[PDB]
Assembly symmetry: D2
Homo-oligomer: 154 residues x 4
Amino acid sequence: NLEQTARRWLEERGVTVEKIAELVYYLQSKYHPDLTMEECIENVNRVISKREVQNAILTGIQLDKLAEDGRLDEPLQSIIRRDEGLYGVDEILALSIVNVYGSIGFTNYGYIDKQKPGILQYLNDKSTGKCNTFLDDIVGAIAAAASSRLAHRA
Amino acid sequence: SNAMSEFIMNNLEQTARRWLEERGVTVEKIAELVYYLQSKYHPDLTMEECIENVNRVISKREVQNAILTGIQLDKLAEDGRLDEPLQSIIRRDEGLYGVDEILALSIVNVYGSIGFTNYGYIDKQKPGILQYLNDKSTGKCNTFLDDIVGAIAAAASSRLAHRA
Amino acid sequence: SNAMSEFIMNNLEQTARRWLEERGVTVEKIAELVYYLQSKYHPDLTMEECIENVNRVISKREVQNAILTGIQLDKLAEDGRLDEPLQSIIRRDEGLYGVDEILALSIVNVYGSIGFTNYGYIDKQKPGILQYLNDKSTGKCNTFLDDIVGAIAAAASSRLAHRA
Amino acid sequence: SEFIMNNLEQTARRWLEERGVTVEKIAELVYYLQSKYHPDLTMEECIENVNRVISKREVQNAILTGIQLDKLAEDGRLDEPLQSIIRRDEGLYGVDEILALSIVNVYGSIGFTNYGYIDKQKPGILQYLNDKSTGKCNTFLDDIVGAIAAAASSRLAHRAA
């Protein structure tokens, strides 16, 4: 009942196994020019296929939505809502995701977590009124999680 | 905004302490867990000695950030305000849900890898308050809290150790 | 050589197993800990299913890397070939050194945060081989091995659970 | 117990230098990561943070271990196949990633972003350390210095509010 809920929750906000893959493609496009955008997608599918990751996305977005619609007691409400730089509970879940496939993909998550290419740029809410404080972290975390797998099979 | 940011992030300790008290946890009963872990290695160890450390860990934003988020979900899941399937999963406190363990680690790391073993150790032996927080009969949902209470105890011991 | 790299990173498993044997640890013995960790909940648990789970853990590149590294270090500290002060810190299983626990956590994480609490727990009670590995008088350094065997049993444990 | 070992900050420092890395070189990386976010951020400020980090036992522990392996590897004293795996800096071997993340966590999760970032930019000594044709093994020190910078950088943030 999880593998599923995950993707519709992911989609429900505006993220697809597609743009996610567009990211994994960026992290290893230069190193694997010989590869299909489909390849990326399946690693992404396998990342999202593991419980620990799904176990998070729910928790992650649950807070994002819960903060956006703000039923959060203060100052937690404000903290999350303002994607506070000294607040790191989000990056923690992000880490568990990236950690699923091992140490190998850490420097990765940290690069797209700063830079923020593709949809990560969007999810940093360009004032979309929405709160993507956690997903912006779990998303990129899933990407680099896939980058670490993509290499574990090639 | 920029200054409202600083004000908010520098004023979490008091609130984090209150919530703990509001869920049944006392800095002292946590310190009680610290004596349980560090006693053996420290006969001379004082209860006040521990309290100090417990207070030390709690004075950390990373830990507040943890303590707040933890007791936040613990409540919504207790007031059934959470969406499904998160609501039930968290309310049930099932062994396949790990996030309640991912948060506790971030507290434990605050003082290093050394505290890892003690953490899992009291998370199993559930001595002191942990007993009450893991009790599913009380009607209260302590999915996250009994993990962070144990983590805080661990981290305090990790810090106590770094001091000796 | 890149093809040589593939050949190497793809063939670490049995080496990892041998090194464990050379250091006195058998898959069985590790399996026995998984037993201890899960027999109270699955009385009908067969030692076979335990082994199958421990083998699956060790089949992980991650674990293999941790095993080779930690044993390599115990071996070096044992033949006093490390440089001071690392040499004493590892040979004497120094109290504030957590590099061994850091390596273990990478094994535990292989199967999630669930196996964390079990790892710290067993990494305290020190049953089965752990008792030997911790001994401290056999003239053998097992500072890293101790933790990694504990970590594997705990990851195996977590896997067994995820399945049951 | 043999918990005994007091601060190894001074020894950690020497091992770093002896491997061609100064607190100053690491500080420069801290500037490179915070200079842009802080007006008149001074080098003194960078070195402080770098020193605060390097003074933590958690970090020291990582530094001694990481460097130690790098040394044994370039001297060809490890056991095969670990010897080649470490010497060749095998990308699928992540124990060095492990030790580095170790250093990062000493100062929160804010460092994860800079660790990755300076990891790819590879400025300053990171160019020397990452070379691969100096006949020197820096499989571990590489990540370690990148991590030390990240942590100090993270520390510098917390100590700004």
